[PDB]
RNA sequence: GGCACCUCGAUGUCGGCUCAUCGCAUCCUGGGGCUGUAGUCGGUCCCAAGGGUUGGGCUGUUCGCCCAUUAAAGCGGUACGCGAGCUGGGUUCAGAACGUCGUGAGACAGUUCGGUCCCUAUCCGUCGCGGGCGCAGGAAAUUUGAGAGGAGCUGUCCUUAGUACGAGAGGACCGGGAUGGACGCACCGCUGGUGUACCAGUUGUUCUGCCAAGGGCAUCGCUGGGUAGCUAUGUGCGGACGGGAUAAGUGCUGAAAGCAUCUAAGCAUGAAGCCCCCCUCAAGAUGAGAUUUCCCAUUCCGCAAGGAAGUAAGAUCCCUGAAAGAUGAUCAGGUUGAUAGGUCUGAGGUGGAAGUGUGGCGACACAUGGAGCUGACAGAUACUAAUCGAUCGAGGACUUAAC
């Protein structure tokens, strides 16, 4: 896909920090409520890390007011401003789907600091 | 699925028209032959362009 | 894609692993033309594993090649011959190790046959 | 993504506990329902203290869905639990408060007053 | 009405200006050459036989070599007319390279569909499956032909069969960006056909 | 219902699941005339089959009732459409009961429980794909489109407007603007689904002499993810913008009947109808078309008619295969070569391999190291296999006219 790679390069976002699939990074996202853009911080654990250049995405997730939220973020979207990895975490796998059902302290066991 | 009637000899032979197998292609061997169909080792000398492997 | 041969998938692994072992001792084998085409893809990869000479690579050969005796008196394992004989013989060459000449159809069921041998 | 005969737990202080769906109001028509869709619904269960009572037939607007909602930005949202707020005729919610996160998809619709009661919007 | 037909290679996502995600199809498009120009007073109709993807002489037939000789061009593969070009448009033999298409133009797309192979009616026509339980042997099968009175199957009655490989129009697709240096087209929305298949890029009807 | 002309050496009943199509006395949408039509919303009679025609509860049911909807949830024909497609729930076999009738044996358009629905498609039919010959010489192509099919439905909101109207209450016609439903056509790059020669973890037993590290089997042993391909519940698009003659209507000039009068003369207006615009198959449209570019005008017989043997353009047999595919066919190719496999470099997937060292009593953990493993996805590389060859294939019929 060398030609396909040539197109994606123009929209490539090298500014984004490198990170492991298992961590509590905090994506910033402007929201056009109209007219001013609010900045909603959203901490959570990433799970999926699908490949495919610009099409790459990751699934940050967070419990909120007793209920979880699954807000996927594409890796190279313009809407992201900055990403801060508050904590690193050891992971025996790559697809941590199971943790969402394991409320609540059990989820923290996979969230061990590194 | 029981047929209502016996087939006529005409329709039968007409069905037989396409049933026949086609003749395989053949070529003379560079070494001796004869002959050898394309892209397969001869059962005779066993030569293959033109190496002798059995 | 990969050919099925109609075999059960569990059988398909053993069916390939058996042919890979029999080629080691016999150096050459005649089988059906279609199975022969499938055969070259698996065996040549095994030869690549023997190139590095790595101890980890030898264990990978055990996953496929079975523990059958090769040459008489020498008592070499079927795995061992690849790391001692075939590897040195193809240190220069890179791929194309297994030529497969076609052969006439078998009388017993019309199945086309093909010779398989290293080169 | 919600099919007919799909119980949906209550997200507001209507006094109801669980609320089964009846039929989508959209078209002849659509069976599926994302967020912001209005659906007539039955109250299978309810807390003893509240205006709502069991077996009542009242419309409710979807607030949360297990299915991943789509946006033009490409961002997706899928809550751990499905939810709806009870509403009658005028779209002001019967619930004094709305528990949990609320989808922003409601905001594009003139449903904005409901959004104001939300503790947080995602 | 212009149409630089060319093979697609791979699907891509492309965002610009607005933050919304826009799916995009790559197209090889350029270069193309006018092998011939039809005339209504002689050929009976207005058309231009554009070619695509030049190839070595070894694959070219002798009569094909003569057809391009008038075009002052090397022998080339597929050829299609595009009624109705605005004559005189271009001089004979002139090259074309994506210059016509702007990002704002709406563009119809036509091409051979990907082969699904021989298939059942449910895929071929979307017919509902029969019950899988309650002792019913019936499922997947197309069902009754219809009325007994005609004593014949109605023509055009749906039956399972091979699908795909037929040319299929997809109207009103929109271009996203233009890359003339790489001869790339970037049309929004799905474009029908197998990977690396030829695809026409005719101008959309307006308005 | 009546009659007993089809069938009692077999026409398998009812209601559904399946797919339909047809006809209008048109449920809705579009066109209107009259209203006890203020507006809004209706009533009625005329145009109109183009399209759309609901999800459940009760009952074997049709029907009907009820609930929630919808622009509307119209009827009927097609062996009360379809069982060599399916369902046996209802009646319509043999068992058993209740109630009633009969001395009994049994019976009951009275009811209840259980109860083998057989069949390899010959022909005509239809959905797809080839092999032949023809198309007055052989070919490679590109297409004209006689004809044929598909598509054909609509909701809301934002404006003009809170204006026209109405005491108020209510609330438009028309012209524009955005967003959905139902359905249809396509593609995976997102969302995912699957993914049996991909990766990892793990159980029992057995096999590699024992360790470490693996193999076989147990549904792929099980479990967790997933390339490609295949896919919708995902995405993108579709019914748009307009003409031609009209239907019911609305008419304009004017006569037969000096006035009058849509018509008898003559000119208009006028609909999701019809014809095209839109998309698709199509010159076996034996009416066999048209245009572009190639091969040449042979060699042998027979005085003639006509027939053979080679070849040119080109194609095939065979072979590497897939963007194709049941088999043919189609397309990419056949050694001045990337067609497939392999070999290298990647992408993606699964993710800290083996070995070694260190910490710990052990079990394990850490380091070496985003390592290792990689089936179909890419980029190059003749390293292998697409050998060597063979076969098919035209010498342009006779007339008339213009030259």
From TrEMBL, chain A:
GO terms classed as biological process: translation
Pfam family membership, one: Ribosomal_L19
GO CC aspect terms: cytosolic large ribosomal subunit
Keyword terms: Ribonucleoprotein, Ribosomal protein
Lineage top rank: taxon: Bacteria
GO MF annotations, alphabetized: structural constituent of ribosome
Role played: This protein is located at the 30S-50S ribosomal subunit interface and may play a role in the structure and function of the aminoacyl-tRNA binding site.
Family: Belongs to the bacterial ribosomal protein bL19 family.
Listed name of the protein: Large ribosomal subunit protein bL19
Name of the gene: rplS
UniProtKB/TrEMBL annotation, chain B:
Annotated Gene Ontology cellular component terms: large ribosomal subunit
Pfam families according to UniProt: Ribosomal_L32p
InterPro entries registered for this protein in UniProt: Ribosomal_bL32, Ribosomal_bL32_bact, Ribosomal_zn-bd
Single GO term (MF): structural constituent of ribosome
Keywords of this entry: Ribonucleoprotein, Ribosomal protein
GO biological process: translation
Assigned protein family: Belongs to the bacterial ribosomal protein bL32 family.
Name of the protein described by the UniProt record: Large ribosomal subunit protein bL32
Gene giving rise to this polypeptide: rpmF
From TrEMBL, chain C:
Gene3D superfamilies registered for this protein in UniProt: Ribosomal protein L17
GO CC annotations on file: cytosolic large ribosomal subunit
Matching InterPro entries: Ribosomal_bL17, Ribosomal_bL17_CS, Ribosomal_bL17_sf
Molecular function, one GO term: structural constituent of ribosome
Gene Ontology biological process terms, A to Z: translation
This protein's UniProt keywords: Ribonucleoprotein, Ribosomal protein
NCBIfam families reported for this sequence: L17
Assembly: Part of the 50S ribosomal subunit. Contacts protein L32.
Family indicated by similarity: Belongs to the bacterial ribosomal protein bL17 family.
Protein name, UniProt field: Large ribosomal subunit protein bL17
Organism of derivation: Bacillus subtilis
Gene name per UniProt: rplQ
TrEMBL record, chain E:
Region span, Disordered: 121-151
SUPFAM superfamilies: Translation proteins (SSF50447)
InterPro entries, sorted: Ribosomal_uL3 (IPR000597), Ribosomal_uL3_bac/org-type (IPR019927), Ribosomal_uL3_CS (IPR019926), Transl_B-barrel_sf (IPR009000)
PROSITE patterns: RIBOSOMAL_L3
Top-rank lineage group of the source organism: Bacteria
Keyword Ribonucleoprotein in annotation: yes
Keyword tags: Ribonucleoprotein, Ribosomal protein, RNA-binding, rRNA-binding
Gene Ontology CC: cytosolic large ribosomal subunit
Any GO BP annotation: translation
A molecular function (GO) term: structural constituent of ribosome
Subunit structure: Part of the 50S ribosomal subunit. Forms a cluster with proteins L14 and L19.
Function: One of the primary rRNA binding proteins, it binds directly near the 3'-end of the 23S rRNA, where it nucleates assembly of the 50S subunit.
Family label: Belongs to the universal ribosomal protein uL3 family.
HAMAP family assigned to the protein according to its UniProt record, in alphabetical order: Ribosomal_uL3_B
Name assigned to this protein: Large ribosomal subunit protein uL3
Organism classification: Bacteria, Bacillati, Bacillota, Bacilli, Bacillales
């Amino acid at each position: 896909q060398k030609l396909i790679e040539d197109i994606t390069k123009e929209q490539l976002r090298t500014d984004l920090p490198a990170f492991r699939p298992g961590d509590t990074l905090r994506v910033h996202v402007k929201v056009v409520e109209g007219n001013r853009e609010r900045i909603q911080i959203f901490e959570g654990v990433v799970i999926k890390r699908r490949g495919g250049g610009i099409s790459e995405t990751f699934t940050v997730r967070k419990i909120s007011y007793g209920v979880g939220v699954e807000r996927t973020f594409p890796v190279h979207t313009p809407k992201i401003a900055k990403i801060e990895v508050v904590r690193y975490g050891k992971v025996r796998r790559a697809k941590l789907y199971y943790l969402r059902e394991l409320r609540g302290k059990a989820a923290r066991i996979k969230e061990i600091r590194r | 699925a029981v047929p209502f009637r016996r087939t006529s000899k005409m329709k039968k032979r007409l069905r037989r028209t396409h049933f026949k197998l086609n003749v395989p292609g053949m070529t003379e061997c560079p070494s001796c032959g004869e002959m050898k169909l394309s892209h397969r080792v001869c059962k005779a000398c066993g030569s293959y362009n033109g190496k002798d492997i059995n | 894609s990969y050919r099925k041969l109609g075999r059960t998938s569990a059988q398909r692994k053993a069916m390939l692993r058996d042919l890979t072992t029999d080629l080691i001792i016999n150096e050459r084998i005649e089988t059906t033309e279609t199975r022969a085409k499938e055969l070259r893809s698996v065996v040549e990869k095994m030869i690549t594993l023997g190139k590095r000479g790595d101890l980890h690579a030898r264990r990978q050969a055990a996953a496929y090649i079975r523990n059958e005796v090769a040459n008489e008196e020498n008592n070499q394992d079927a795995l061992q011959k690849l790391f001692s004989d075939i590897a040195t013989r193809y240190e220069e060459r890179q791929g194309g190790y297994t030529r497969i000449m076609k052969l006439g159809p078998r009388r017993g069921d019309g199945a086309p046959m093909a010779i398989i041998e290293l080169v | 993504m919600i099919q007919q005969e799909t119980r949906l737990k209550v997200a507001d202080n209507s006094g109801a506990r669980e609320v089964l769906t009846i039929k989508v109001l959209g078209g002849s028509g659509r069976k599926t329902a994302n967020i912001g869709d209005v659906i007539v619904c039955t109250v299978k269960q309810a807390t003893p203290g509240g205006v709502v009572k069991k077996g009542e037939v009242v419309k409710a607007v979807i607030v949360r869905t297990k299915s991943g909602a789509r946006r033009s930005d490409g961002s997706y949202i899928s809550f751990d639990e499905n939810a709806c707020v009870i509403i009658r005729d005028d779209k002001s919610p019967r619930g004094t408060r709305i528990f949990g996160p609320v989808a922003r998809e409601l905001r594009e619709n003139n449903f904005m007053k409901i959004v104001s009661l939300a503790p947080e919007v995602i | 009405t212009k149409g630089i037909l060319g093979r697609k290679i791979g699907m891509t996502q492309v965002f610009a200006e607005n933050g919304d995600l826009i799916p995009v199809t790559v197209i090889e498009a350029a270069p193309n050459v006018v092998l011939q120009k039809k005339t209504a007073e002689n050929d009976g109709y207005e058309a231009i036989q554009l070619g695509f993807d030049d190839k070595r002489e070894k694959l070219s037939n002798k009569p094909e070599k003569g057809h391009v000789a008038k075009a002052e061009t090397a022998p080339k593969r597929f050829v299609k007319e595009l009624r109705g070009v605005e004559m005189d448009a271009y001089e004979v033999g002139q090259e074309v390279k994506v210059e016509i298409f702007s990002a704002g133009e709406i563009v119809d797309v036509t091409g051979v569909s990907k082969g699904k192979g021989f298939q059942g009616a449910i895929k071929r026509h979307g017919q509902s499956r029969g019950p899988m339980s309650h002792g019913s042997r019936y499922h997947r099968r197309p069902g009754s032909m219809g009325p007994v009175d005609p004593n014949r199957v109605f023509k055009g009655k749906l039956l399972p069969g091979r699908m795909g490989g037929e040319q299929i129009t997809v109207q009103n697709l929109e271009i996203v960006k233009v890359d003339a240096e790489r001869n790339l087209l970037l049309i929004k929305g799905n474009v029908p056909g197998a990977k690396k298949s030829l695809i026409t890029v005719k101008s959309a009807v307006k308005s």
